[PDB]
Amino acid sequence: MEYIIKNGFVYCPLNGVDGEKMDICVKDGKIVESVSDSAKVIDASGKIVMPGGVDPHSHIAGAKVNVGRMYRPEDSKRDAEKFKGGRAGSGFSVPSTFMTGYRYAQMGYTTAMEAAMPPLLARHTHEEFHDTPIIDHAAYPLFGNNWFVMEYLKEGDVDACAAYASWLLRATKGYTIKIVNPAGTEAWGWGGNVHGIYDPAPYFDITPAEIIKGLAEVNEKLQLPHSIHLHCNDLGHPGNYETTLASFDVPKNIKPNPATGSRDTVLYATHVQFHSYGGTTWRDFVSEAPKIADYVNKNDHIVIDVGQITLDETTTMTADGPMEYDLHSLNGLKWANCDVELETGSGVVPFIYSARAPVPAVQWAIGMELFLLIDNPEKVCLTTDSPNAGPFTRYPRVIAWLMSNKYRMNLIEGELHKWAQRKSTVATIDREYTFSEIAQITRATSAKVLGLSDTKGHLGVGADADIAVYDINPETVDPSAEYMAIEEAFSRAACVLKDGEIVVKDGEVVASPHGRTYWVDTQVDESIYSEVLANVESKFKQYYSVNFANYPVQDDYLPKSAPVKGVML
């Protein structure tokens, strides 16, 4: 087909466009030089044109997500929907798969990544992906508590660990090396945890620091498009900012070597809000977000996403088993758990972030500090660790908060507990993000760090025709005083194109194509690879509960496979 988007104010930070009236030309799914004048014209006049949104960190497909769906029928009853032409669905904080895809598209998102996939449960993730419409996607296999990973790194055998990763990435059709509470979830297999990056789990005798550094070497030896994706030890603990700063330094002398894309950072640290806590207990608790922001500003090896508190009743779901039990022990609410043999753990607990409550008030402020005190938006991504800190449907509200210090002050001086002012600096910060900087943290930074900025996160020629048009006129609209207009216009996009096909018109879904599954294809020395694959199968016969032949994901589960090349022989 052919499309041309006319007279829209274009915001594309990867190509230096900062709200310039400019036409975008689309053909057969790509953005092109121009088109014949029989092209269908989309009048974006008086409206903002951005690339399709790219979510680097969401919990949307797989076992832990579906437990949250299953064991919260009351979350479904709060928010059940059925619109003509669409599938039925429900779930306010943990939406069903069709609903998940619909709601990402409505707010202009075309690509979102599943953040924590247990390898033995990979078929489950991909099956939900198939029932997730529109968005392209990928899943992050978990490595930070894997028995092969711990055994190989403790043997000093980084090369063998790299071959195992190559096999696992291919066998699970995964995309990044995700690290969640290294060693601590293995320790939770006995009802324990680790504390700090120098505290090993039982038997395996390898510290979190060694896991982080070993896995960052693997990542770059395999030339993966993304970096290691790190969820630090000691999540949610007063005084954990010291653990977090030490975790950031572990791999910073390793040089990034991606074979595909333009990633120039070796560490991606996710939902850093939960890792920026000062004090020693909940009673002397304070925000240490300025120290974290200062580190991010002064260092050029790291990208972060925030994990902003939306101040809702939501659901927590992480591969951080012991943390979730600790949460259940605090609020008393229903607790799910799943220790996965040889691989990982997980847990699910509802949680209510009331603005009137002191700690959630500070936590809200900590995320705002991280957004506003980090000077260069090229290092930060907008997230809520969906749904841990809030559902992704709240991203437009986070945007509005960042573009309007009046919106923030309304909350701070009204509902917000006074600890937001007493234990944080959010109230002294009057910075407001610009439409360009918003575009940067919702599309460009994530696309680049993920290694997909060739085709995603930008409107330049050669990209995929993933386009969003929002009904905002930047020459007319005041984002500071009209913050509610911003939130609503970013929640219901005027028009969204997915690979050159219109899928949303005026906030409503009009087409549901299946998206692509990106995964990482890597090649490793045949001799090493054979040696590892012999040891792996031998361990399956002894210790796994399934036969080796049945473990890898069959091609039936990737109807629309999109391999991305890492290292090649």
Binding site: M70, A80, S90, D131
Partner: protein
């Protein structure tokens, strides 16, 4: 005689994936490693009816038709119903189950699986209090206390103990000798015969017994000197065994889902397991029955948001076990048509439900002759999953394993039948 190894067994929720099939001339004639039940499903027993072709009853005698005519009659029934019930699902693969949900939306149906006569009570329990589980390999490699509460694995999950208890694991290299085995059952089952501790409690008193165990666990004296026929001192000793575990697993089954209290028996079992984790690592696993009952609940949940007893009558999905369950719609005479796929409610529902199935149109996607096919008005024989057709199944603790097609069949698969049926139901509206 081709040997097919690494076959996944399509019977029980243990979902053994190490079956070896003896294939002699596009037919399965024997197995290796499969238990006596598993072997029975893989192998045809002489004299048993296997439906070659579709059927429709006219005068109490069935008449052979084509797939198209039988699917057309079936789609006609569903499309003009005002409260159609689509029940079963647990013995077919997940793609067929997913078409079923889209069909249930189109038809405005109630879609429900066998959970509503099985671990549905466990589903209701876990929605209220949570779900602390692990996978089989963790039990195998870590567990030193194993508990079978109200289940009889020797008879219903025959290889479950050998795979999880006698098995030697990384931190349990002595196998059976490294594990304390507890069975809780009013009967001296063949499972209880292997146990180190058999709590032969009074029937229908588990809830009372677990109330005493929980209260003793939290440091409270037990009011009565005998609970559920178990002496006070023996209850305190049992609780001490659980507190001293390095890794405990609680397997449980129909003894507490079917007995007095139902979902509240599971409720209180779950909360004890949760609270045990302040003293010892503890988890539970429900002994899911059919090899892919867990799969239907997975699929339904992720597509609609709810696991079973899902009503699409209003467009939005709505959920109320006790109203929108299969036995509720039949016993209250709400349903005016029943579609049965991969299940035998004729054999396995109570008489009050059977009384309603006799009054309404009944459609059966069934390969064999059952009590359900006796109550049926249309019969549609499919290809059997894990023998003649492939697709995903979910083990009892959520592990997805792809069933395998061992032999060829001229018959249609469940997924194919439903896809054509769906298309015709759309039409008839």
């Amino acid at each position: 005689m081709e040997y097919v190894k690494n076959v996944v067994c399509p019977f029980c929720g243990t979902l053994c994936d190490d079956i070896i099939c003896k294939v002699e001339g596009n037919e399965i004639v024997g197995t290796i490693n499969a238990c006596r039940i598993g072997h029975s499903k893989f192998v045809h027993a002489e004299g048993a009816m296997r439906y070659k072709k579709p059927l429709i009853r006219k005068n109490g005698e069935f008449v052979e038709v084509s797939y198209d005519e039988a699917i057309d009659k079936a789609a006609k029934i569903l499309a003009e119903s005002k409260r159609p019930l689509m029940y079963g699902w647990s013995c077919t693969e997940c793609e067929a189950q997913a078409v079923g949900v889209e069909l249930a939306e189109e038809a405005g149906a109630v879609i429900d699986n066998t959970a509503s006569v099985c671990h549905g009570p466990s589903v209701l329990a876990l929605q209220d209090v949570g779900y602390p589980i692990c996978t089989f390999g963790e039990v195998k490699n870590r567990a030193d206390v194993v508990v079978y509460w109200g289940c009889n694995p020797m008879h219903a999950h025959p290889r479950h103990m050998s795979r999880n208890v006698f098995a030697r694991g990384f931190f349990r290299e002595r196998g059976r000798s490294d594990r304390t085995l507890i069975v809780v059952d009013p009967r001296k089952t063949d499972s209880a015969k292997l146990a180190d501790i058999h709590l032969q409690l009074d029937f229908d008193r588990d809830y009372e017994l677990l109330d005493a165990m929980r209260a003793c666990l939290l440091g409270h004296e037990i009011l009565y000197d005998e609970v559920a026929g178990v002496p006070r001192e023996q209850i305190e000793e049992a609780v001490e065994v659980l507190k001293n575990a390095q890794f405990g697993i609680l397997f449980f089954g129909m003894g507490i889902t079917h007995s007095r209290g139902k979902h509240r028996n599971i409720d209180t079992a779950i909360m004890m397991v949760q609270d045990l984790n302040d003293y010892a690592k503890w988890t539970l696993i429900p002994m899911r029955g059919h090899y892919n009952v867990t799969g239907f609940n997975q699929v339904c949940t992720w597509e609609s948001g709810y696991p079973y007893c899902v009503d699409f009558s209003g467009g939005e999905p709505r959920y109320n076990p006790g109203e929108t369950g299969a036995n509720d719609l039949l016993q209250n005479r709400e349903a005016d048509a029943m579609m049965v796929i991969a299940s035998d409610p004729g054999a396995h529902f109570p008489q009050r439900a059977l009384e309603r199935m006799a009054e309404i149109p009944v459609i059966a996607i069934e390969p064999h002759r059952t009590p359900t096919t006796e109550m049926a008005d249309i019969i549609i024989p499919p290809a059997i999953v894990g023998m003649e057709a492939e697709g995903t199944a979910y083990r009892m603790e959520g592990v997805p394993i792809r069933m395998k097609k061992v032999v060829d069949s001229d018959l249609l698969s469940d997924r194919e039948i439903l896809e054509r049926l769906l298309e015709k139901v759309r039409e008839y509206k």
